Symmetry: C5
Subunit: 311 residues, 5 copies
């Protein structure tokens, strides 16, 4: 088999469509997601044209090996897609309608800057390489782009599944390549992060601040050091669900900043004890009373500054 | 091969059945379960009809490639099922009896609202796409739907395996699709959660309340902060077996509420110490004595309210 | 190819044998184990009979596709076995000797009631479905059932590998099914549980009982709360190697009971402190002295009761 | 099929090229990385020469089985590459242009000495074994070596992808082998290690040094022992992301050294308490005051020495 | 195809060789390792003999399906090897030279008695089963046994790769089996265990002994209980990288023994406090002073005894 010949000098247009059946396993650390979808392909092959009136058949069904099929691939997949041809239909003028159901693990970079209040644009890049005989170009049949209503991505809200209709045509290894960008827009369900990580992290921090209403050094050391260790546990827990980033994430910024609050609280607790031992408690009292206001105020203002810089 | 021709204008009815052999690996985080079952298919193909007298055979056995077989797929599977054809039997009138044994990883959403006292309805969606020549519709042969008596799902009780007899017929990519819903009803074995998570979590909370019978601030700080850290460990342990949900789970609600009890216990312990240092112990004694009743009473009432809202 | 015809109305007997080469990966949580073995099959096919005198050959060698082979399957496997045919030998009377080497992941329920002093009977169920032309029945050739001397299952002792010689013949989807039960009896190597989990768990518990020889409330709170947290760590460690069970395991019973001992020790420590603060130390002394005897005595008797109920 | 015959006694030159499409999963512990790329091959086969006038076509397209293709393999791969032939083009003189897209898990040793400020040279070794009829030698077509602009390796910066143009020709099992070295130079994104591991580790260490401004032995024991335990947690966290090395890593050296600082701090805290109990506080005061300067000074100098030895 | 006929009554000798290309993933818990190697096979098949003068060729190249090839298998593999035939060469006298490149996951028991200062002998068992027509025996061609210089096993030192030249010939299911033992000798790189596990474990133990220079019960309880908990963490860490053994490992023996030292240290701390409360400090002082010498002395002697018993 060889590609369909051009009537004049035009490239062969392969109309494409992706219909999502299932979306699952969005792995933040690996920056991958699994997809199960229909891939539809359509092109004109005049060598396959037939007469509807004489044949009595309006459509002809072929096996993939019987006819020429464009070699369509995915750019950003771990391994080649697991595909099963559903149907191949040829109309009298030779218009081929190809349909396959596939499953693939897609590599798509994620921006963690606003985590866990982040939104992502996942990409599925469709590609075709031109042949010596003729140039193959990709197009989007909007009527064949979509998703099943039941499509759910655990821990995420699916906003839209659209295609950038204009392909990216470029030369690669002295041959033309036609690339299409299918975009799956998602937003993270931040809900569970509030009662499980954010509020427990704030509770232990506020518990360390009770040391500002205590003169007992031994109890203060226990309050600030124990809560700091619990904060380290939350820092470790958060970083297990995330890859290492060359930038600060919103959660990472708050987590880092809270260490400074624990460090300064230890200094205050040390300074307070030192002064009391030195028979200067009136002074230790001034620092402790100021700390009661300073710590929540600086914490509130620093969080307003951080939320502003990130959102 | 092509589909069987209609005698009049009727769709081809493909009778289906699923007989469960094995059920395993219900993954809560992934919202998947693995299945090993028999898939039975039945349809009339008049082109395969034969005479029992002249052939001397009552039934004819064929290889899948020798005859036309409907392209039956599963909607909610990770990858295409691993299938092996067991038997293909044709009766004299051309009634085909197809039997295959398959294994598949099924994606089926789970409702964690009542966890670990939750029940689920797992789904296996059977589907067929219509061809140009004729429309293919699915039906349930109740005589061929069931499960082996030994079918066990570790950590779950299997209630029933039934099929919604009426298919969901709809248009997808300008062709008719016929979808059947096979339902596996299961209920979680909550037993082990009681001695391993629920009671240890209650024990540490009740241990923190012993601080209401102590005037020792240093011992009280140790009691409430240490048990809080153990509560954080249980919260982390529980969330490792669960995906992130955009709603509160029953266990999650109790776990979250217990943090408030630890936070208020720290306030009480701080207030008690502060008053005693300020030479107001008679007052601290009133707050501590009230706390001895208030903490278990509010805990009991809040749990009754939560159990009511969730069950 | 079609099945061998019956001389009279008898079922076709397929003689079976399993020879274990390797046993590995017994997964307690998944209730699976991996196996690498020889599967031997033998049946009479008169259509394959030949003359030993005239041919000069005692045996004929065939390729699997050249002759009829019974469709033998495993009931309790995750996916279909990975099999490679080793030999097919036909004797002059038409007796076929089939040999394949296979590997499979077997699902076999485990009874954790006596863990880690438990024994298990792992099952490998062989099955054949009857055809329209004739009924197929399975048999055990004891001469072809066994295991390699070097067969080791890490963390387990292999006792025996035997087969229940009588098949379970039953009707499934209007056809006869012949099922054989191959049993691999194993006993857990409990050794390592003693120095790694049991004795460290007992050491920390006995350390909490030193609080009965101390009047220091602050030190007592530290002794009982710290060791309780270490007990929680051991409880979590034990449950990571086990699935969730709808029953109590022996280890689970001891682990649960030890929480009650920590809870009552906290009550004692609280009662002792309360009385001393109330200027009643003579009374606190009576409770503490009684606790020194009561705690080890009740612990010993409760363990005798538990060991009796479980063994 | 057999190899192309030599015109004289020359080896067959197979021109190669690797164009990276995707780079992912750099596993530090396993010392592997996954790659998705184009492999281009070119060689002259005069037996495939054709006349464009007689055949009509200027270039001929073949299926891999139809013609002789050199057996090109990767040396350092876990399993054989997952490859799909994209195109096989034959020009009139018999010049074959082969193009395949492949995915592979590559084993490439990593030097962790400067971790997490390390750089690596990942290797992809291309190899061909000579046949009896003639010797096969590999060459690099620099025009067909490259990488997609979007190629990203999560947690790493990609510097370059080049090939050592001269093959390593050697004898292996009495036949010639021609090996090419494709090099992917990467540098670790150390950024996240600073707020997540390095600074929290320094904070807890500096917190232990507050014991040098405290006379309270019981608070000092709490300060140094608690922070030491947090340091053990960070040591364990760091070693989970690394394989075991027969050398010290930069991070490993700092982590190890910090233990010595905790050990000497415990000695100081013990010595201080012992002297105070012995009614020698003036002396304990001299040791404690010296420690306030000695500990940060020795820590700074030891880190300058370590940074010098490692960088 | 059938096996080569014997000239007299001799068994067919199949000469073997294994050349290691890659060694990776030595899994201690699973007792497996992955291998990528060349498997060479050689045997005489007179039916393939040819004349060099008449044919004009000195060697003939065949496809595996064209000629008879002995069914060579690996005994101790999880699944069948992933193999690709590289070359099949036939010399004029009919001497066949077979070469394949394979990858396999090998099951090989490990002796952990001296861990982490252990050495292992990994085995790769080659096997052939005899046919009815004739007996097949295996031999080692030492010229074709070896390993690439770059072969590295992360965390291990590779000593040698040799073969036991004499096969183990035995009867299995009334047929002869010929088994060869290929041995890969390795020694563990214990280096990293010293700064990461051994020395931190010793530091925390020595820190618990500072309680013998302290009269403060509350600080002593904190010293011994906190370090014991850190020792439990190291015990858990060590056992995660090891399978459960029916024997004591060297590290396991030291780890277990250290618990006894913590237990006796708690008794000493309790006895010391009890006597001081009972107004007997002169006596408590004698026990504490003796403990300062006894604990390091008994620890040193017990370790000398253990090292002697294990090495
Ligand atoms: C008034 C004293 C202010 C002390 C400020 C401490 C600055 C620490 C800088 C860390 C930089 C990163 C290095 C940690 C040492 C902590 C010393 C605690 C202070 C001692 C109290 C003395 C009371 C007079
Ligand atoms: C300690 C700090 C606690 C966290 C504070 C909330 C972060 C925030 O402000 O989060 C903001 C995000 C919404 O982000 P967005 O609207 O989608 O960004 C797009 C906005 N632009 C386009 C204008 C830039 O979530 C929320 O509305 C937060 C609701 C939950 C609050 C939980 C409080 C505990
Ligand atoms: C009578 C005093 C009541 C204190 C109530 C504390 C409200 C905390 C609100 C947290 C909201 C989330 C922020 C945490 C600070 C804790 C202060 C502890 C009280 C000090 C005791 C003084 C005794 C007179
Ligand atoms: C702290 C709080 C402790 C947990 C309290 C039990 C939760 C509950 O009430 O759980 C209820 C579930 C049963 O739910 P169901 O009957 O199937 O729901 C369907 C009911 N409708 C249809 C009416 C809505 O389990 C039990 O019977 C609990 C038995 C174990 C108790 C363990 C106590 C510790
Ligand atoms: C003589 C007092 C006995 C106290 C028994 C405590 C029973 C706890 C029941 C838990 C049920 C599950 C709920 C936990 C509260 C602990 C209170 C500790 C006792 C206070 C000491 C007073 C000394 C006079
Ligand atoms: C705290 C409690 C500590 C655990 C006590 C041992 C449990 C037990 O008694 O275990 C019993 C099992 C043996 O069980 P079996 O003989 O195979 O059961 C079959 C018996 N029938 C058929 C009569 C029912 O192991 C042992 O012999 C235990 C040896 C190690 C002791 C470690 C002590 C620490
Ligand atoms: C002036 C006393 C210096 C003590 C130096 C301790 C050296 C420890 C060597 C560890 C080698 C690895 C072995 C740990 C014992 C710690 C003893 C603590 C000192 C007691 C204080 C006495 C004050 C007079
Ligand atoms: C406690 C010790 C804290 C760590 C100190 C930094 C290590 C270092 O000095 O790291 C050095 C590396 C750069 O290494 P390079 O230039 O690529 O090596 C090649 C150099 N040659 C060729 C000359 C040998 O990162 C940095 O510039 C460090 C920036 C972040 C500092 C974080 C401080 C906290
Ligand atoms: C002189 C007293 C020696 C005490 C020896 C303790 C032996 C413990 C045996 C455990 C066997 C496993 C069971 C743990 C109880 C610990 C008691 C601590 C001793 C009380 C001090 C009294 C000082 C007069
Ligand atoms: C607490 C105890 C600390 C561990 C003591 C070392 C164990 C040992 O003695 O290890 C011994 C092994 C060597 O064993 P081998 O020579 O290969 O055995 C074969 C010997 N035969 C054939 C004679 C039986 O490593 C070493 O040389 C140890 C070097 C590192 C010491 C780290 C100290 C911390
Ligand atoms: Cl693809
Ligand atoms: Cl499917
Ligand atoms: Cl099977
Ligand atoms: Cl390869
Ligand atoms: Cl094999
Ligand atoms: Cl024998
Ligand atoms: Cl034999
Ligand atoms: Na085609
Ligand atoms: Na068909
Ligand atoms: Na067959
Ligand atoms: Na070829
Ligand atoms: Na304390
Ligand atoms: Na062969």
């Amino acid at each position: 088999v060889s590609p369909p010949p051009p009537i004049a000098d035009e490239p062969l247009t392969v109309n494409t469509g992706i219909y999502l059946i299932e979306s699952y396993s969005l792995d933040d650390k690996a920056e991958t997601f699994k997809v199960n979808a229909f891939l539809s392909l359509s092109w004109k092959d005049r060598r396959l044209a037939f007469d509807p009136v004489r044949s009595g058949v309006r459509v002809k069904t072929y096996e993939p090996e019987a006819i020429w099929i464009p070699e369509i691939r995915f750019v950003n997949v771990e391994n080649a897609r697991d595909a099963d041809v559903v149907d191949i239909s040829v109309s009298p003028d030779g218009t081929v309608q190809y349909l396959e159901r596939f499953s693939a693990r897609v590599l798509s970079p994620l921006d963690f800057r606003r985590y866990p209040f982040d939104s992502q644009t996942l990409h599925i890049y469709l590609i075709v390489r031109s042949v010596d005989t003729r140039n193959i170009v990709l197009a989007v049949d909007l009527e064949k782009v979509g998703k099943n209503d039941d499509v759910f991505l655990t821990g995420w809200d699916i906003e839209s599944f659209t295609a950038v209709v204009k392909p990216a045509n470029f030369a690669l290894e002295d041959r033309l390549e036609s690339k299409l960008d299918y975009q799956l827009r998602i937003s993270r369900q931040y809900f569970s992060y509030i009662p499980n990580i954010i509020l427990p992290m704030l509770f232990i921090l506020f518990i360390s601040w009770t040391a500002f209403w205590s003169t007992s050094y031994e109890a203060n050391v226990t309050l600030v050091v124990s809560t700091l260790i619990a904060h380290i546990a939350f820092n470790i827990l958060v970083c297990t669900n995330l890859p290492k980033t060359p930038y600060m994430t919103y959660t990472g910024a708050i987590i880092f900043m809270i260490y400074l609050f624990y460090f300064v609280a230890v200094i205050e607790v040390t300074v307070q004890h030192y002064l009391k031992v030195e028979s200067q408690p009136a002074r230790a009292a001034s620092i402790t009373r100021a700390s009661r206001i300073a710590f929540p105020v600086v914490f509130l203002l620093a969080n307003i500054i951080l939320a502003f810089l990130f959102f």
